[PDB]
Amino acid sequence: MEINVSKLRTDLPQVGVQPYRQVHAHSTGNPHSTVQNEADYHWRKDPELGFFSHIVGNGCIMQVGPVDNGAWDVGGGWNAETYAAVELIESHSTKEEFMTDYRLYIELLRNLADEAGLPKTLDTGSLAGIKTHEYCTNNQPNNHSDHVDPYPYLAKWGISREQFKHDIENGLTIETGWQKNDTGYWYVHSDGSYPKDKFEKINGTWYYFDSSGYMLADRWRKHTDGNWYWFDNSGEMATGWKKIADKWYYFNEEGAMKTGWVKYKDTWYYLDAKEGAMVSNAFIQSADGTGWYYLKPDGTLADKPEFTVEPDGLITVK
Amino acid sequence: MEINVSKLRTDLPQVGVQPYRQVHAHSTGNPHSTVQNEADYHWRKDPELGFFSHIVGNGCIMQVGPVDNGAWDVGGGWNAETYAAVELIESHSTKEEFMTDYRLYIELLRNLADEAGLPKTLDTGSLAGIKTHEYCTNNQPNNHSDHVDPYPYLAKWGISREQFKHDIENGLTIETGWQKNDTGYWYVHSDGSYPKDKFEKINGTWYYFDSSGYMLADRWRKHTDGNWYWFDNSGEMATGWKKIADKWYYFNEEGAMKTGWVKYKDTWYYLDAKEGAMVSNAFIQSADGTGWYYLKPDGTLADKPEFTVEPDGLITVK
Ligand SMILES: C[N+](C)(C)CCO
Ligand SMILES: C[N+](C)(C)CCO
Ligand SMILES: C[N+](C)(C)CCO
Ligand SMILES: C[N+](C)(C)CCO
Ligand SMILES: C[N+](C)(C)CCO
Ligand SMILES: C[N+](C)(C)CCO
Ligand SMILES: C[N+](C)(C)CCO
Ligand SMILES: C[N+](C)(C)CCO
Ligand SMILES: C[N+](C)(C)CCO
Ligand SMILES: C[N+](C)(C)CCO
Ligand SMILES: [Zn+2]
Ligand SMILES: [Zn+2]
C-alpha cells in the first residue's frame, strides 16, 4: 500500500513490550479535520495527550507513528498491546469520500494484523487481533477510557457493526460500474450504491433502472414528469423517430415522447395525442378549429389534398 | 264472504257437544284435486274416513259440512272441539294461484274464529282458538293422527310457520300495484312479489327496477344484452330520439341505444360508436373504408360538402 511517512514521529516512547497482540481501529472524533490536519497536529502535539500510528483520510494513508512499539491510543492497559493504531477521519462530505477511505482503512487494518502475526478478527474474546477503541474501552484492564469509536461514525455512513466485522474478517471487494447477471444489468457507483426507479446518465447516455436496480431494455416507462420514455435493447433512452412494435413514435432530444404535429424534412407528421403513434389516412382538426388537415395513408401531411364527392355524397380524398 | 253451499252435506253426525272451542286449519294433501274435486269427493265419501266443513281453492270457498257440530277432521279427541275445519287445496301451479287462495283461507279462518266466539290465535296453549292439524296431532288427547298440515304446503310457497301465525293473528293485507315512498316507486304483483334488477312491462309500458325493487327514473342502465337503456322522469323506457344532459341519443323501438348511422326525415345523423351521442362537425369513414362522410355542425349529413384548400393546405368544409 502507498504510505506517506512525511509526518512520521520518531521521538515517541515505547509503551509496554513486544509482542504486541493488537491492532486498534479508531476514528478521529473530529468532524472537520483533514488527514493532513490530523498529521500536522499529531506531529506537534504533546504525546501524553495520546498518540497513534496511522491516519486514513482523503484517499491516503499517513503513518504518523511507529508500529510494533505500543502506543497511548486507547486510554488503558491495552495501550501496552498496540502494534498499530489506525485512525479514520470523520470529515467526509459524501458517502463516496467515506467509502474511498473506508476501503483503505479495512485493507490497512488487515495488512497490519498479518504483518504483526495476528488473527484478522474484529473484537473477539481472544487477546490478539483487531480491536476497536470501543472494545478496548469495554474490555481492557486498568481502563481510563470512555471512547466508543469507530462504530458511531461508521454507522453514520451505513456501515453497521456487523458489516465492519465482516469486512475486517473477509476483506472488502466492491465491484463497481456495469454489472450483469441472468436477470439484467445494474450500475454500481464508486460508493457501492446503484440507481433504482430513476434515470441515470452513464458515459454520456441516459438509462432507466427499475426498483431493484435492473436496467430497462426494450420497454416503455411513464416518468414522474407525466411523459412517456422508451428504452431500446441496449437500454439507451430513445430520441428522435423510433418504430416500436410496428408503429412510429417521435421522441424529443430529452427523450420525452411527443404528440401532435412534428416536422420531418420536407413534410409534417401527426402523432396521436392519446397513444402517441403516427396517424395516417385521417383528418385532424386545425388548432383554431377552423378547418382540417389531411394525413395520407403513408402518414405525410397532404399539402394539396384533392376531393371528389359522390352523390352520397361520399368523399374520396387524394 | 262468498260461500258456495251447493255441496254442503246435511247428513253428517254431530261429534262431541257444544261449545266447540277450535277452528282447524288443514290442507288436502292432494297435489292434483281442485276445489270442486274435493267437494264432490267429500259429498259422496264415507264420513268415517274423515270429514270437514270448508274447502278453499281456485278462488272460492265451498262449504261442504256444517259448523258448530264437531267433525272427524283431526283423527283424535279434538274432533270433539271442531267448530269448523278448513281445508286448503294443494294443487296450485303458481304462487299467484296459491296467494289468491291463501288470502281467502286466512280471512275465513279468522271470521270463523270470531263467529265461534274464539280468540284469533294460532296454535297457542289455550284450548280455544285456531289450531293446525299439526298442533292437534301433537297436543290433542286420545290422538290417532300423524298429519302435520298445513305447514309443509304453506312453506312450499314461501309462508313460514311464523308468517302463518302472524297472518292469522293480524289479518293479511297485500297492497298491490304501484307503491311509493320517500325513496321511489315499486310495483307489487298479485302474489306480493315485485321486480328487482329487471325490466317489467306494466300497463303497456316498460320500466326497469333496481335490486331493491325501486323504479329507475332519469337514469341510464347497461342491460345484460350489452345494450344501453335510458329511463325518463316517469321511469318510462326511452325510445326514439332523446336529448339527455344536452346531448342527442337515439333508441330503437325496443329501447336499445343505437350507434352508427340513423335516418331522420330527409337526413342522416351519426351517433358516436363509443358513447352514443350525436356527432357533429366531423368526418366519418365509410364502411368500405373508401372515403368519408361529413357531418355539419348541426349534425346533419352533408349531401354536397364543398371544400376549399389553403396553401397549408388547411381544409375548410361547407
Ligand atoms: C443488485 N441487484 C440488482 C442484483 C439486485 C437488487 O435487488
Ligand atoms: C418516416 N418517419 C418520419 C416516420 C421516420 C423516419 O425515420
Ligand atoms: C428526464 N431526464 C432529464 C432525466 C432525461 C432526459 O433528458
Ligand atoms: C401508449 N404508449 C405507447 C405511450 C405506452 C405503451 O404502453
Ligand atoms: C348513410 N350513409 C352515410 C352510410 C350513406 C349516405 O347516404
Ligand atoms: C319494498 N321496497 C321497495 C320498499 C324496499 C325493498 O328493499
Ligand atoms: C333533431 N334530432 C334528429 C336530433 C332530434 C329529433 O327530434
Ligand atoms: C329488453 N326488453 C325486451 C325487456 C325491453 C325492450 O323491448
Ligand atoms: C355512455 N352512455 C351515454 C351510453 C351511458 C351513460 O353513462
Ligand atoms: C403543421 N400544420 C399542420 C399545423 C400546419 C401546416 O403547415
Ligand atoms: Zn479511538
Ligand atoms: Zn288435516
Side-chain angles (χ1 to χ4, degrees), chain B residues 198-212:
Chain B
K198 65 196 304 305
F199 282 94
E200 193 88 41
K201 181 150 113 147
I202 300 169
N203 288 308
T205 295
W206 283 102
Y207 305 84
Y208 196 93
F209 296 87
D210 76 10
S211 74
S212 298

Side-chain angles (χ1 to χ4, degrees), chain B residues 77-142:
Chain B
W78 283 345
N79 283 353
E81 292 296 344
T82 307
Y83 179 88
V86 182
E87 295 264 11
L88 177 65
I89 66 176
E90 303 193 16
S91 54
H92 305 102
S93 302
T94 71
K95 180 165 184 158
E96 164 167 330
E97 298 176 337
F98 167 83
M99 287 297 313
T100 290
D101 289 342
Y102 180 75
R103 290 176 172 90
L104 292 171
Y105 187 65
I106 293 299
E107 188 178 3
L108 178 56
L109 288 159
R110 284 169 52 81
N111 275 18
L112 285 165
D114 284 342
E115 173 181 300
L118 313 173
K120 294 185 294 298
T121 61
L122 185 70
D123 291 3
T124 65
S126 87
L127 181 62
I130 303 169
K131 312 296 182 198
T132 60
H133 197 156
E134 171 191 86
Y135 185 88
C136 292
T137 286
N138 286 344
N139 298 271
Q140 78 188 324
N142 301 125

Side-chain angles (χ1 to χ4, degrees), chain A residues 24-44:
Chain A
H24 294 153
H26 297 270
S27 66
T28 65
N30 186 326
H32 303 110
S33 53
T34 64
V35 70
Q36 189 76 49
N37 294 157
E38 291 285 334
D40 294 338
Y41 171 69
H42 186 270
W43 179 260
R44 67 180 185 258

